[PDB]
Amino acid sequence: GSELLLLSNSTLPGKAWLEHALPLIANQLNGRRSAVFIPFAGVTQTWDEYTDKTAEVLAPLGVNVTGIHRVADPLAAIEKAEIIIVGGGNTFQLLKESRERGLLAPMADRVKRGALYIGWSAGANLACPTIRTTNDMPIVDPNGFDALDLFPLQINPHFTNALPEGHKGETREQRIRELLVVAPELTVIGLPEGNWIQVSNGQAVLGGPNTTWVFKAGEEAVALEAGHRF
Amino acid sequence: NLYFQGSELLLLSNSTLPGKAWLEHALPLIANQLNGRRSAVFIPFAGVTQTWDEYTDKTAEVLAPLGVNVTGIHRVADPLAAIEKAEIIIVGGGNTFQLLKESRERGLLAPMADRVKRGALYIGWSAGANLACPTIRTTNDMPIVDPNGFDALDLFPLQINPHFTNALPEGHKGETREQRIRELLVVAPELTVIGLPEGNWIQVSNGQAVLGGPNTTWVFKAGEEAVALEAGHRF
Ligand SMILES: N[C@@H](CC(=O)O)C(=O)O
Ligand SMILES: N[C@@H](CC(=O)O)C(=O)O
Numbered sequence: 001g002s003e004l005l006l007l008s009n010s011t012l013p014g015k016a017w018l019e020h021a022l023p024l025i026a027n028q029l030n031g032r033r034s035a036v037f038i039p040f041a042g043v044t045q046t047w048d049e050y051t052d053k054t055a056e057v058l059a060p061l062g063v064n065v066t067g068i069h070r071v072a073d074p075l076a077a078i079e080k081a082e083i084i085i086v087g088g089g090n091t092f093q094l095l096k097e098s099r100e101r102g103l104l105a106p107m108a109d110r111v112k113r114g115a116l117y118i119g120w121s122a123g124a125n126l127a128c129p130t131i132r133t134t135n136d137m138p139i140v141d142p143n144g145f146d147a148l149d150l151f152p153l154q155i156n157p158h159f160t161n162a163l164p165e166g167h168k169g170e171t172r173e174q175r176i177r178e179l180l181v182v183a184p185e186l187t188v189i190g191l192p193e194g195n196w197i198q199v200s201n202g203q204a205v206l207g208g209p210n211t212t213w214v215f216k217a218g219e220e221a222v223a224l225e226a227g228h229r230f
Numbered sequence: 231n232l233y234f235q236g237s238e239l240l241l242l243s244n245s246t247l248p249g250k251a252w253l254e255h256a257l258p259l260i261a262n263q264l265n266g267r268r269s270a271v272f273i274p275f276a277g278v279t280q281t282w283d284e285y286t287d288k289t290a291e292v293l294a295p296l297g298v299n300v301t302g303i304h305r306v307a308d309p310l311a312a313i314e315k316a317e318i319i320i321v322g323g324g325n326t327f328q329l330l331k332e333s334r335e336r337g338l339l340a341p342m343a344d345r346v347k348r349g350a351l352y353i354g355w356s357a358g359a360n361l362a363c364p365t366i367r368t369t370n371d372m373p374i375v376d377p378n379g380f381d382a383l384d385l386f387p388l389q390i391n392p393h394f395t396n397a398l399p400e401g402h403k404g405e406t407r408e409q410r411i412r413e414l415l416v417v418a419p420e421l422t423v424i425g426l427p428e429g430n431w432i433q434v435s436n437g438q439a440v441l442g443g444p445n446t447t448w449v450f451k452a453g454e455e456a457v458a459l460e461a462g463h464r465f
Contacts, residue, residue, distance in 0.1 A: 009403055043413040090413050092373075132374055135404065138327075138367055139414040141380050145373055162399035168244055168428055169370065169393040178278040178325050179374040193403055 004199035007120035008157045008191040010088050018057050026061050032082035032116055035065050040097035041089025041122040078106045083116045086123030091134040094122050095142035108148045127151045159190035176215045184217040204230035232465045237346050237385050239434035242355035243392045243426040245323050253292050261296050267317035270300045275332035276324025276357040313341045318351045321358030326369035329357045330377035343383045362386045394425035411450045419452040439465040
């Protein structure tokens with residue numbers, strides 16, 4: 001009963017920021033226009049700049065964006081929002097700010113009550129039960145890895161198993177396999193750049209041109225393509 | 231500009247060089263720093279995909295020719311007594327979050343740090359190098375378990391980012407390693423982050439922290455361009 005758009009990344013090569021998301025958002029708005037933007041993943045630019053950038057790219061769709069860090073009453077803003085938009089950046093800072101501000105439960109409840117959730121990269125991580133499949137560096141302690149729990153599977157965004165020539169560090173699959181040792185019940189979706197998962201009208205639909213990989217404990221990786229229904 | 235460092239540390243970026251055996255490049259470094267020490271306790275908790283028993287036996291085997299006797303801290307009767315009596319503390323690579331979580335849950339963090347401060351030799355590679363720093367905030371590992379805090383041993387005052395490379399797979403739009411480090415420098419502007427490439431190490435001995443290894447090391451500080459360093463540099 002949730003409406004989610006979970007994107008692996010913001011920008012396709014040679015395209016504008018969020019350009020590929022616009023038609024997906026347009027088809028899922030269903031008349032919604034009022035959005036609150038959660039900017040807390042952003043580190044290297046101000047949350048004001050991040051909000052203004054998001055407002056600009058979505059304006060042609062008729063969406064009005066308000067930055068949650070600028071409103072007097074963030075709980076009321078989330079309550080009245082039709083759309084909750086969570087930007088990419090550092091997933092640990094995103095979760096830490098969201099938890100410290102008491103926004104996790106309100107955001108999840110608002111989405112469960114029919115609001116559209118749009119998140120890319122770190123914003124896709126936050127939709128999962130935990131952030132345990134983020135690729136980000138732990139620059140701040142979020143005081144727990146539990147997240148919004150709007151999507152039941154773990155998403156690993158920006159998925160690629162490639163490494164620089166001669167690198168001896170863990171592959172992405174090796175990192176994921178370690179998670180499957182400690183949490184053997186999990187399903188991990190390796191969502192490559194350019195892909196997304198759209199949850200709408202009772203179906204979780206895989207989208208994007210590249211191959212998606214599913215990892216489960218003790219099972220070989222399974223390749224999926226656009227149109228798969230979870 | 232570090233002041234006199236009174237600990238004996240060997241902090242390796244990684245375990246295995248291309249075309250070499252596991253820890254082969256570390257053996258001469260360990261041998262030349264032992265200074266007569268023989269008794270080592272191994273901290274295996276970073277290991278996920280193999281048992282800590284297998285990890286310990288592997289470490290014991292590779293170090294036996296150096297005269298080092300290895301016991302795994304997970305199977306001693308009294309881990310606090312084992313650390314107190316150990317001459318060498320060896321912390322293996324693996325997942326840094328699990329390493330820190332087990333070390334904290336078992337109450338070993340302070341005993342390990344205190345024993346090293348009391349003259350024990352500390353050897354760590356990869357996750358074991360992260361653990362020597364004030365925090366694990368520069369690990370490259372996935373947060374598969376919650377360590378209940380990112381504070382670590384605080385034996386080495388600067389942050390090490392091991393396996394350092396700024397390269398990305400063809401066409402990848404994710405963050406570069408330097409971009410991830412620059413974000414840490416926003417939230418923690420006082421930090422120095424050492425981008426320690428594979429094949430390199432930092433050896434703290436006789437009061438000096440000395441860079442080692444054939445590859446270029448990069449130092450990141452807030453608002454400053456990355457600084458290239460080479461073997462022999464004193465931090
Ligand atoms: N840091 C990434 C998310 C991830 O890779 O976990 C982003 O938001 O772009
Ligand atoms: N996981 C790495 C450590 C790191 O890259 O942070 C290792 O132990 O080999």
